[PDB]
Design a protein around this ligand. Structure first.
Ligand code: GLO
Ligand code: GLO
Ligand code: GLO
Ligand code: GLO
Ligand code: MG
Ligand code: MG
Ligand code: MG
Ligand code: MG
Ligand code: MG
Ligand code: MG
Ligand code: MG
Ligand code: MG
Lengths: 386, 386, 386, 386
């Protein structure tokens, strides 16, 4: 049964189990966690690696001697546990200088400072082993319409990601970027609000191949969108470089519940998709243990993230492996969807009378899709009533 | 003041003022309108053109002799009024044969029939003068997770749009396609749910240049997204081929209120963007006069669509033309957003100590953005209190 | 196994399995079902009874001979199967005359007609043995602000329910009313939009005890509310007279999915609540088999409604029965929540220095609620991982 | 012009212009404001009064000497400006001890502490002349289903309000309570989530007449509800004791934009309602100047709150005063809505053949409501296009 292994590739941010509980209406309920303690406890839980924002590891404002003490300590913990660092990112949202954005701040000097802060952390991420560098532009956007010309801000956003592509190319680094979309919060509306908007943006950059997406369950659900559908389009585009797993219960503030909570059936269809498409990147949890919890509650919430992924993996595997489900898929013509519509081109199609002139539209309209039966088989597998 | 002219390029679908009032809980409240009567009345209201789905003009199932009677009659009305037909589209949603989709139906023969129905109407649209052919895949999607493999459905969707690109290319037609996104309704989740998802999809087609988007105000608002922001990204990508104007009051069923209703400030920021970016396509209204109205109420609702666009155009023009607003934009550093972040490349940026080492982060953090003052000037212009 | 029997009190509307699949963008995909055939197919499935709108049983406009003939063949089917009719309701939304409302229509003659149509069906409901009479005011509301004065509409809505209470009291009928709330659709905004608004309104009627609520899963979820929370307040108020069970996947158009679909964890906490509070009314399913389905998919969807309630009942019962869960509830102090705050009274609380001046606020702040461990035990029980 | 004077009853919380800009992803961008400076800058702006949470005026944990000193300098500022204190409230959400609630915390000692903290501030509110005492239960609720038994929590919530009613009655205080509803944030789901739920709960308290509601624009809009509709029901119930005015752009995190921003047409229909129903309470602004702003942007945002109410008051007044609008209201039969449906009574309605057996349902169905023309006249008046 459900014990995490290194092969499950479960990772967690320093900021997830390290969340102190501070929210818009309340102070911290927990003490700050030491990164070294977090690496050790996560290694004991069966996680494979940890990720970080620069300001999680090195206190904003640290002198270069305090910086290397922090880095050194962290790296001894990693080396002692065998924990990996698959991804890293920059905090371009906490400090008041980023109140109007990092890469798309109206003030040019803030945009330059944002880029220098990011490059300093790309060098660190690369020596720690990170292959993905995430960008969450949480402050890029607006609360009012004339505060941001969005066509000019997209020029500044393209310009910042192109300069970053330039830099990693000239250094010969093997890192790839993954843009993390979110529709709103903390800005009234955030630029590149969904997976689709981030995908389309990448196609306009100088080096498209260096950039993919880091979609998060709760973010797409804050726009009422189907997260497994958005992940299937990112996989179809070859751009799912990383993923953030957690839970969200509707269109409201961003909750970051542990994975499995929130929309449980969407979590099931997501694990089924990730596992049958053979996604091989980290299964990263970007969640917040509720501020009602003490530190024992924090590790119970982190353990529940992994446990729920493994139960859903087991149930999805059993659903697809079941002969009855395989027969129900044929009955709903999922095999026929995999056949080309018109492989002999549009002239064969135009000549075929059975495709239009002689098509019996009413016989075809009367065929049932048998979708409810197939979805109740999926419901029975998820609940273990099969 | 606010009289529609031909230069305003206002157009309406046959199905908008022709909506009979039928909804999921109620029967029709109005009689069916004759297309000829609609062309004449819209021409009297000051509209520039009309659009149509094939089944609006020619009754589904018409023999080829009844088809040409309908077409002939319509074309005499257009010719008598000088009304244009800038866009046309296919109905791939009403008939029960399309219950699981047109282009991405699981049944291969339905997908072939969908493509033949569409090509027949592209030929008609081209001889009537349409330069844009819209595709709204209202039935492409699902209510349950195993009913549609979305990666395979995107293959079938790419395949259908590529066959259509093939066909118009081989015929030498000057039509371009515009995909119309919608997140849900009538399917639980519709494929390519937002402007961003449709933009990203286009980049994967064989002939990307033939395809753009037809975004609709209320559709992006059904996902709680900022519609002026999504339009600015489609304009930045060079893909705003057409637009559908109406109103929506929140995340709920698709209302199609007349333009100006619903989110009035978003309507203001949309007209400001369309007018200052010099969009030159039709201002098309895809709206439904509420079923509470009789035919006099239908033409009053259609007239209100145009009237509201012209009042907002006038207010947005006055906002941007005001010296005080121009001064407030400089104060919020909207001019500095138009300056390149690092035009002398990443090595100049890396060497600049003022960009990091010597950057006074606290002086910069303390600068106010002056955004509330600028937005209250915009509020005063919209309300005519300035 | 999970076989329904009439002992489980499962009931279905004639309009549910009977929906023909017509939606805002599509025509019917199924033929009309004969009520007699519905009564015996539902009896075969293990249902306990059926409910109806007047217009589901007797076609609008039937002559009295035709009316009596429909009632006759229906009642014969009831007698033959042992099926009961627990509830009935009026259709005050389909006919065009109800386009601005039934009870709160601006036209006074339509409000009188709405009342006569309802009274006629109350007499029939009582003859068939219905104990609850539902009123869903789906047309009471507005799309625009000046169209409905809402304080005056609530006077007309109170007036209508007061006259229906006077009528059944004069007749000595044992029937009570249950108001069914819905936030929107088919009107832009519907009056009494949630459970709370309907509960508050009832306290203003002349005979408050004759009226309760008939909440529906998907309706409260269309406003992003927690449906188990809404039901606990209705049960706390002693007003849960009936309940409509189905599924909804978020804030969008009203889907009416089969129960168990949509928010599955909310369905689990709902069955946990109804079963532990000892609700004794009908478990009524107001759902629509998707229009993708044929008649065999209709009965599979209906059967799935009952199966899912019975699986969730079993898991909720096993959860509450588990000693480890019972121990986790004590650790989270749910036993202390049941203790009175200040049964000693106000002056004793004011004299209690340990309640304020000597309360150690930091020792209390430091106690973790242990809610994540508890919620993961609930997750394990729902998935059958114990 | 639109200059506020104290005659307009505009009031502001100390926590509003006083917000320092700390949010879930960011630190403060503004220094703390001294209450004394807020009182005189707001008096200069034309405000009538200020409101407070205990912890806004007296820092949590102040010794009684420090407490009295804070109250002293505040009261001196009040006396010097002629500013009033119409309302006050308790902070039962910021301190970590309130992480699972104040009045419905699972820990009994915290619920007693919550009551003592509130009573202490009721005595201070009454001394400063407050007539309304608001209770916003922002921590009463849950993120998971078994963490809070909601029927027992509502017994504890009733118990707490009953004891506060007993306390002010024994003291002979002339102060009434107003419950402030909010659907979520900071808890996953908050108890009494909307106006209707709070209204329904009040009818179960021991002294219902001591309690009403303090609805907030953005809170009801976080559940997609019509705020003018919610306010008309509270006014119909005689329970609108206070109101919080601000803006919200849809269903997402609570934004607290300045009034007039967000849904501008809902702000117009809200001022129309408050002004035509003769609401006489404070027009209170509970908003947050965006963290992008400096202290000058704080006072511009505050001034904009008042300016927008005064512009919308003028347009709503001109709308209702227009003979053409008065004629349009008669055409839409808003005068007939005010007529009793059946003042002749139930048996006369039953004997009226014109109400049913001789009602021409198709002539009534054919009458248009003329609501679009009416709504466009309201649009013209709001935009000043007449
Ligand atoms: O909602 C907030 C974001 O998801 C944030 O937590 C990012 O994940 C982090 O900045 C790394 O990308
Ligand atoms: O919401 C429905 C769609 O917007 C529909 O009305 C399309 O506009 C039409 O099929 C032409 O594209
Ligand atoms: O969403 C609509 C309602 O659920 C409606 O169908 C009612 O259930 C019916 O009028 C009788 O109860
Ligand atoms: O969104 C939160 C509430 O608006 C809160 O700030 C209340 O207004 C305050 O506790 C006193 O009324
Ligand atoms: Mg998040
Ligand atoms: Mg994330
Ligand atoms: Mg629409
Ligand atoms: Mg459209
Ligand atoms: Mg429903
Ligand atoms: Mg119902
Ligand atoms: Mg708020
Ligand atoms: Mg408030």
């Amino acid at each position: 049964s459900y014990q995490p292994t290194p092969e499950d590739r479960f990772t967690f941010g320093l900021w997830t189990v390290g969340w102190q509980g501070r929210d818009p209406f309340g102070d911290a309920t927990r003490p700050a966690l030491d990164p070294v303690e977090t690496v050790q406890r996560l290694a004991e839980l069966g996680a494979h690696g940890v990720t970080f924002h620069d300001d999680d590891l090195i206190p904003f404002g640290s002198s270069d001697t305090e910086r290397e003490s922090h880095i050194k300590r962290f790296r001894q913990a990693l080396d002692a546990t065998g924990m990996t660092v698959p991804m890293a990112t920059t905090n371009l949202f906490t400090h008041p200088v980023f109140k109007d954005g990092g890469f798309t701040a109206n003030d040019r000097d803030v945009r330059r400072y944002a880029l220098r802060k990011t490059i300093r952390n790309i060098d660190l991420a690369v020596e720690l082993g990170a292959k993905t560098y995430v960008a969450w532009g949480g402050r890029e956007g607006a609360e009012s319409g004339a505060a941001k010309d969005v066509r000019v801000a997209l020029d500044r956003m393209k310009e910042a990601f192109d300069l970053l592509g330039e830099y990693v190319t000239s250094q010969g680094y093997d890192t790839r970027f993954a843009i993390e979309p979110k529709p709103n919060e903390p800005r009234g509306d955030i630029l590149l609000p969904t997976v689709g908007h981030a995908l389309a943006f990448i196609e306009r950059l100088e080096r498209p191949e260096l950039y993919g997406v880091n979609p998060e369950v709760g973010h797409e659900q804050m726009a009422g969108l189907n997260f497994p559908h958005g992940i299937a389009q990112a996989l179809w585009a070859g751009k799912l470089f990383h993923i953030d797993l957690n839970g969200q219960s509707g269109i409201k503030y961003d909750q970051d519940l542990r994975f499995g909570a929130g929309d449980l059936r969407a979590a099931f269809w997501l694990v089924d998709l990730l596992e049958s498409a053979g996604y091989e990147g980290p299964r990263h949890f970007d969640f917040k243990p509720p501020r009602t919890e003490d530190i024992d509650g924090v590790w119970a919430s982190a353990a529940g993230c992994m446990r729920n992924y493994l139960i859903l993996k087991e149930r999805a595997a059993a659903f697809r492996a079941d002969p009855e489900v395989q027969e129900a898929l044929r009955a709903s013509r999922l095999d026929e969807l995999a056949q080309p519509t018109a492989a002999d081109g549009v002239q064969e199609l135009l000549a075929d009378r059975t495709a239009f002139e002689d098509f019996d539209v009413d016989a075809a309209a009367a065929r049932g899709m048998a979708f409810e039966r197939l979805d109740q088989l999926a419901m029975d597998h998820l609940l273990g009533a099969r």
